[PDB]
Design a protein around this ligand. Structure first.
Ligand SMILES: *[C@@H]1O[C@H](CO[C@@H]2O[C@@H](C)[C@@H](O)[C@@H](O)[C@@H]2O)[C@@H](O[C@@H]2O[C@H](CO)[C@@H](O[C@@H]3O[C@H](CO)[C@@H](O)[C@H](O)[C@@H]3O)[C@H](O)[C@H]2NC(C)=O)[C@H](O)[C@H]1NC(C)=O
Ligand SMILES: *[C@@H]1O[C@H](CO[C@@H]2O[C@@H](C)[C@@H](O)[C@@H](O)[C@@H]2O)[C@@H](O[C@@H]2O[C@H](CO)[C@@H](O[C@@H]3O[C@H](CO)[C@@H](O)[C@H](O)[C@@H]3O)[C@H](O)[C@H]2NC(C)=O)[C@H](O)[C@H]1NC(C)=O
Ligand SMILES: *[C@@H]1O[C@H](CO[C@@H]2O[C@@H](C)[C@@H](O)[C@@H](O)[C@@H]2O)[C@@H](O[C@@H]2O[C@H](CO)[C@@H](O[C@@H]3O[C@H](CO)[C@@H](O)[C@H](O)[C@@H]3O)[C@H](O)[C@H]2NC(C)=O)[C@H](O)[C@H]1NC(C)=O
Ligand SMILES: *[C@@H]1O[C@H](CO)[C@@H](O[C@@H]2O[C@H](CO)[C@@H](O[C@@H]3O[C@H](CO)[C@@H](O)[C@H](O)[C@@H]3O)[C@H](O)[C@H]2NC(C)=O)[C@H](O)[C@H]1NC(C)=O
Ligand SMILES: *[C@@H]1O[C@H](CO)[C@@H](O[C@@H]2O[C@H](CO)[C@@H](O[C@@H]3O[C@H](CO)[C@@H](O)[C@H](O)[C@@H]3O)[C@H](O)[C@H]2NC(C)=O)[C@H](O)[C@H]1NC(C)=O
Ligand SMILES: *[C@@H]1O[C@H](CO)[C@@H](O[C@@H]2O[C@H](CO)[C@@H](O[C@@H]3O[C@H](CO)[C@@H](O)[C@H](O)[C@@H]3O)[C@H](O)[C@H]2NC(C)=O)[C@H](O)[C@H]1NC(C)=O
Ligand SMILES: *[C@@H]1O[C@H](CO)[C@@H](O)[C@H](O)[C@H]1NC(C)=O
Ligand SMILES: *[C@@H]1O[C@H](CO)[C@@H](O)[C@H](O)[C@H]1NC(C)=O
Ligand SMILES: *[C@@H]1O[C@H](CO)[C@@H](O)[C@H](O)[C@H]1NC(C)=O
Ligand SMILES: *[C@@H]1O[C@H](CO)[C@@H](O)[C@H](O)[C@H]1NC(C)=O
Ligand SMILES: *[C@@H]1O[C@H](CO)[C@@H](O)[C@H](O)[C@H]1NC(C)=O
Ligand SMILES: *[C@@H]1O[C@H](CO)[C@@H](O)[C@H](O)[C@H]1NC(C)=O
Ligand SMILES: *[C@@H]1O[C@H](CO)[C@@H](O)[C@H](O)[C@H]1NC(C)=O
Ligand SMILES: *[C@@H]1O[C@H](CO)[C@@H](O)[C@H](O)[C@H]1NC(C)=O
Ligand SMILES: *[C@@H]1O[C@H](CO)[C@@H](O)[C@H](O)[C@H]1NC(C)=O
Lengths: 461, 461, 461
């Protein structure tokens, strides 16, 4: 890539950032109960829980039936001389993708630990705090957690005899209907097929009044650096069990780990407007360029958070990049497109390494040390300003100071090649088909005329 | 549609789902009061409700003025000695669309029932619970409801003498300002024209701390099947009265009914990547195809929820399609495009009716029963695997079982007709059309060369 | 612009609205403390504030480091006869844009007032209410504000001895972790570079359970009309100080003011479907047209709120338009494109100035006073109906009265030039591009043949 030609065409090299991808995940199991455990309210609660049970039995049971029907269709057992491999039976899957088969194998792998967690059903249903721990084994533990258990241990419990019992029943019914509406939002796409559709940690934290840090601290991941603070909206978990007796869900989440792809640099660009032809134009180049061993591609930051030093993505998002745009980035300024603007929010100057790239035709350029104006050179459009011209520079309304030097060759003195204008809207490209087509039928008419005139020239002699 | 040629090019038939549209609605009236009724706080509340009244009088009154002005135009009694009905006076409406005139007719139809509800203004303003009923007639009733009437009957009421009166006044002012900010979000677009703009039930349920099931249960709709549980984010409603004395809004909502369009099947397609020309490509086909009497069209699922067995749309979204795409779907795989990728998240195998469609050039394919590798045939690109090859198949890492057979036609032996390499669907191709225009401009130069050929043609003398 | 021809092609003139821009901002200063002040809880709270302090020290300190670096970059000085200020070092700033330099100038301008506010740190840390005032000067005041200061002055405080102290500690820890999760959402992008990134007032009001009116009333903006009532999501603001001892942020916000751009009219358009060629078509025109002294442009209403009478934008959004679209709007109906639909939600009639523009080919048109059908004229496509034809018009199932007069010439007696069908598909444009491929390879072959003829027969004999 040549930055001098691309600076003369109107693109200024910005920051250089690294590239990191989530990869190599380990698994940790949590359990979520859905019916709140009340024991202080054994005096005045009536049978208000029965409506909530009839509301959630239409959600829990169709999850569990599809889960166990997905569980039957994988069977282990040795295929002859080969050792193992947990055969997924394709007779009873109908139509399935690769990720669905991977999820089926994940359930068949997690069956034993699901049974180990399910062996403590009486231990799970007896909790009476928000988040606590239970001893799973000699060194393993579960992290059972319920959002509403605090609210019927510090708000509704002290009004056990001050307030009337029917008011407690009505308030409990209102809060349970609101919470049932909260389950019916996060577990919405899961009801289609609750083995392949995962659960984001932000939507899962929406059950606890938007408390992501409680889930993160109870899970075990503890961020200590600046890059892992904004990261935390991408922990992904899936359902492995949907037990109906205690009305609870056993969930398995993946602890992320940020690996770095070797030798990849993300390059940002600043686009300014230049005055040509009596109009304001901008180059049509993408902002982000991924460079890895003199190989250029495109990425999209539609799901990736941008930190101060590196790009953190969920997964690789490398797209192929144009050979014409490859010539545009490398050497050919004529291959780079342009677009027309007239709006007022177009920047006209920028700073890079103590080097001012300024359009001095529209913005007044001066030097404070000598008090003389700076005029546009006719050979270039974007004006170099460095310390060789003047130290203190008036640009816009601003005193600025400069430094360093040009760098290899100056982009002010060489020739320029302005590319063609590029438009967008489909009526314009239908008219582009038009002025393709009249020119096309001129070329065909010239083919016919020229080929007749060949034989009156070559044939006649 | 022929699935065999489209599987040979790289598109696999997915599930088949039905199509159902909301339609034929009945109407039901609710009322929402805005001033919370306090009678327990007659000792220590001061006149803090007056600021809330002055805040909401700038909202209720300009709604009510336009609401009575839009019903002041339509008049009944068709001049026709025989024909009779409602007439909309177009000279006073100015500029209007069809739905605005339909809403004006709806208000003129609902004026009598709005007056019947307005006849119990003293009954509406005397409520002191969250949701209750009032006797509208001998068999009809209203469902008056207040969001904050629970919170100043179970939280602020018991601290009537423990806490200081100015602290209750400050807390009531903070709660009323927050609630006034909650009215100023949901009734935002309604302030422009409060007769033609409907209200979604999610935005209306945002007033009640996100409790949609409370409004669904108090309205009368009780879903009992799996399809209607996820439905309930599309119940619309419009304002019919904006009474300023009791500061309440009489609202009319439509109970939805899911009707089924006869003989329409929604079909999905799974796209896999095939290795051709030393590169990874996928065919460019839409995922969703509606089929109705051998007629193919296009739908967009941007506002339609997807259930497990059918598509539920708020309204018909049938878009036309190109005849080239019709030939691509029917017989002509040369009319189907292809696009180029190099990313890692491209699936290379899938399962359909026990038949494995796998690209064995990129993924290692083996058989467990015989332990021999499977090689790509040169006459095809996508490899078909059934029980005739081998029962247990090694794909990737997974053991899988297969079943059934080809059905009618086999993609394993058919000829290949991979079409043109179509370029980028977004605007970048126009930039290519830009240099195609530059190609045109060099053919114009060729025309200019034939402006110089026609010169030396005149040197034929 | 001629509305008769544009009504003949299928576009109906809608409402006329004004255009207003937010501009000329003055500055106000607020301070946001982060640690809630507790003094009633000196008996039973333990040291649970220490974990919250260790959580927020990772947020506060890098902001302060980046801010003091940005103050170090600017340097107050005067090279000769200068404006006695500014001066930013190019070497110390690296790579930057214009807005970042403007933000550096803003911090250097607001340093003195930041020190004046910072002189009352002991006054800032001693507050015990939600929002109160402190005397900054003889006529200036600050508006120190805390969101959770109400909730540990009316809810956790009265249960000081009824509830156990460990339950108070657990509830305080849960509330503080939830609030730390609330800081880690609004100041998310601000951690990257905390001097050039603004804070929206809606995201800032999300800390106080979505109470925008509390911030607006405590800030000083008191909107009293209908236009500025919905405005209030565009207040914005930036950070100027990040003090670590009291753990507070000093923020500077802009009080808005709406100015009017002179002589600009925003025009909407209603698009109806017309039946031509046995198909249903709509013209391809933009909805919004800005007209300013015969100068047409395009605007995008993606960030602008639409009131009843005028458009309010955060900033000017004038985009250029194609001259063929200018010919479409002025005189040429053949320059206006069209698109094909078959869906049912296409409006077929409208009303403008008491004049009915209706498509009577698809929808039945009758006159109620005379009881005769209305037939489509072959010369026109869209039927004009006024009081000269019949007063009461059956359209659809509706009575419509008409009036006023026609307006210059009718859109029914003029000729209609239907433009080209704008309908673009990637495979079709790739196929005609392959026609261009074979076309230039024909023209280059014939030009090589004609150049050989230019060589050895122009010098022949
Ligand atoms: C999930 O799997 C269990 C276990 O069945 C095993 O896996 C299946 C995929 C097949 O390969 C089976 O051959 C295999 O054993 C299924 O439970 C079984 O259900 C059937 C009915 O579908 C039961 O048969 C009944 O049993 C008693 C006999 O007294 C009577 O009530 C009836 O006459 C009837 O025969 C069967 O006992 C039961 N268990 C076993 C071990 O086979 C289960 O159906 C399956 N799928 C789902 C969707 O739940
Ligand atoms: C809504 O419609 C009502 C009904 O009147 C109808 O519309 C009018 C514009 C006329 O065309 C009528 O023929 C037609 O029935 C309007 O109510 C009218 O309001 C005006 C004031 O706006 C009243 O005039 C005043 O009323 C009292 C009468 O004691 C005195 O102060 C004055 O002497 C003065 O007349 C008028 O009485 C009243 N009723 C009628 C029958 O005209 C109303 O204006 C209209 N529009 C709106 C925006 O509400
Ligand atoms: C921000 O600015 C402060 C203030 O310093 C002033 O501005 C700088 C840009 C320079 O032009 C300074 O000359 C100018 O006074 C900087 O604080 C200064 O930091 C240095 C270290 O970088 C301190 O030096 C210390 O000196 C003694 C030596 O015995 C020891 O305590 C230490 O080992 C250390 O070397 C210096 O005292 C300090 N203060 C002043 C008034 O100069 C600061 O570094 C700068 N930048 C940042 C990123 O914070
Ligand atoms: C509401 O439910 C709670 C659940 O915690 C009951 O809490 C009770 O709290 C008391 C102290 O306030 C506990 O008594 C003491 O506990 C420890 C452990 O043995 C020890 O210091 C003493 O020996 C003494 O027993 C008590 O254990 C605990 N009870 C239970 C069942 O958890 C509270 O009583 C309930 N309220 C009502 C009205 O029942
Ligand atoms: C808050 O306001 C409400 C409503 O005005 C008041 O509710 C009242 O509650 C009392 C409870 O003692 C009810 O008393 C009734 O007494 C007899 C007992 O023989 C019997 O008829 C009932 O079972 C009932 O207990 C009273 O009817 C009820 N009032 C109404 C209008 O429903 C309440 O007093 C107020 N609270 C305060 C603190 O002022
Ligand atoms: C919890 O903190 C609050 C903070 O406000 C303490 O409030 C105290 O309120 C009482 C009245 O309830 C005040 O006493 C009286 O105030 C007025 C003067 O304004 C006057 O009537 C009397 O001369 C008398 O002073 C009191 O000033 C105020 N502050 C303090 C420090 O007591 C409340 O006491 C705290 N509770 C506990 C248990 O610490
Ligand atoms: C593009 O640049 C190369 C050198 O990098 C040069 O050889 C070639 O002629 C250029 N092509 C143009 C300007 O079309
Ligand atoms: C640019 O070219 C001019 C001559 O045209 C020369 O004086 C100047 O030094 C050049 N700048 C460089 C090589 O940086
Ligand atoms: C296409 O090329 C011609 C000839 O150089 C030029 O006049 C025209 O502006 C070009 N069009 C575009 C859209 O670049
Ligand atoms: C030129 O126009 C004709 C219709 O007159 C059309 O059939 C043909 O495809 C066009 N050729 C192009 C756009 O290259
Ligand atoms: C499309 O396929 C049919 C047979 O399925 C064939 O007759 C026809 O010629 C094909 N059309 C093309 C290749 O354009
Ligand atoms: C496909 O061709 C194979 C030979 O490669 C043959 O065995 C098989 O019967 C063919 N299937 C058809 C024509 O359906
Ligand atoms: C556009 O309209 C003008 C008159 O306003 C006319 O002279 C011109 O020929 C038209 N151009 C077309 C229809 O292409
Ligand atoms: C349209 O022309 C007809 C005659 O063809 C005439 O009757 C009618 O008044 C005209 N409309 C105008 C000039 O608005
Ligand atoms: C069309 O483009 C291809 C590459 O896309 C090129 O090799 C060829 O020369 C062009 N012409 C023809 C006739 O294929």
């Amino acid at each position: 890539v040549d930055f001098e030609r691309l600076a003369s065409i109107g693109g200024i090299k910005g920051h250089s950032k690294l590239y990191k991808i989530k990869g190599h995940p380990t698994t940790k199991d949590i359990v979520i109960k859905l019916v709140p455990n009340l024991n202080n309210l054994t005096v005045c609660s009536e049978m208000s829980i029965d409506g909530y049970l009839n509301l959630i039995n239409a959600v829990i049971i169709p999850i569990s039936q599809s889960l166990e029907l997905m569980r039957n269709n994988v069977k282990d057992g040795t295929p002859n001389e080969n050792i193992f491999g947990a055969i997924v039976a394709g007779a009873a899957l109908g139509i399935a993708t690769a990720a669905q088969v991977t999820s089926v194998v994940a359930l068949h792998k997690s069956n034993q630990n699901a049974a180990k967690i399910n062996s403590l059903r009486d231990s799970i249903t007896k909790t009476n705090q928000a988040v606590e721990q239970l001893s799973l084994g000699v060194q393993e533990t579960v992290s059972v957690l319920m959002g509403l258990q605090d609210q019927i241990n510090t708000n509704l419990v002290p009004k056990i005899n001050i307030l009337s019992c029917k008011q407690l029943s009505n308030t409990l019914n209102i809060m349970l209907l609101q919470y049932y509406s909260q389950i019916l939002t996060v577990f919405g796409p899961n009801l289609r097929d609750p083995a392949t559709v995962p659960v984001s940690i932000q939507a899962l934290s929406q059950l606890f009044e938007g408390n992501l840090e409680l889930l993160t601290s109870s899970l075990g991941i503890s961020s200590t650096d600046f890059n892992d603070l904004l990261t935390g909206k991408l922990i992904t978990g899936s359902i492995i069990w949907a037990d109906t007796q205690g009305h609870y869900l056993i969930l398995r989440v993946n602890i992320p780990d940020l690996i770095e792809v070797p030798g990849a640099v993300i390059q940002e660009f600043i686009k300014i407007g230049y005055n040509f032809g009596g109009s304001l134009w901008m180059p049509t180049i993408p902002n982000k360029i991924i460079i890895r061993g003199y190989h250029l591609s495109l990425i999209d930051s539609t799901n990736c958070i941008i930190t101060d030093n590196s790009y953190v993505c969920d997964r690789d998002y490398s797209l192929p990049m144009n050979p014409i745009l490859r010539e545009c980035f490398e050497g050919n300024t004529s291959s780079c497109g342009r677009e027309m603007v007239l709006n007022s929010y177009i920047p006209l100057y920028a700073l890079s390494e103590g080097v001012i790239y300024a359009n001095c035709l529209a913005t007044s350029c001066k030097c404070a040390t000598t008090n003389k104006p700076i005029v546009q050179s006719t050979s270039t459009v974007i004006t170099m300003i460095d310390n060789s011209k003047c130290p203190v520079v008036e640009v816009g309304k601003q005193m600025i100071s400069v430094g360093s030097y040009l760098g290899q060759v100056s982009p002010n003195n060489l020739t320029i090649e302005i590319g063609p204008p590029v438009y967008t809207e489909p009526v314009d490209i239908t008219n582009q088909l038009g002025n393709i087509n009249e020119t096309l039928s001129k070329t065909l008419d010239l083919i016919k005329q020229s080929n007749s005139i060949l034989d009156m020239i070559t044939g006649g002699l």
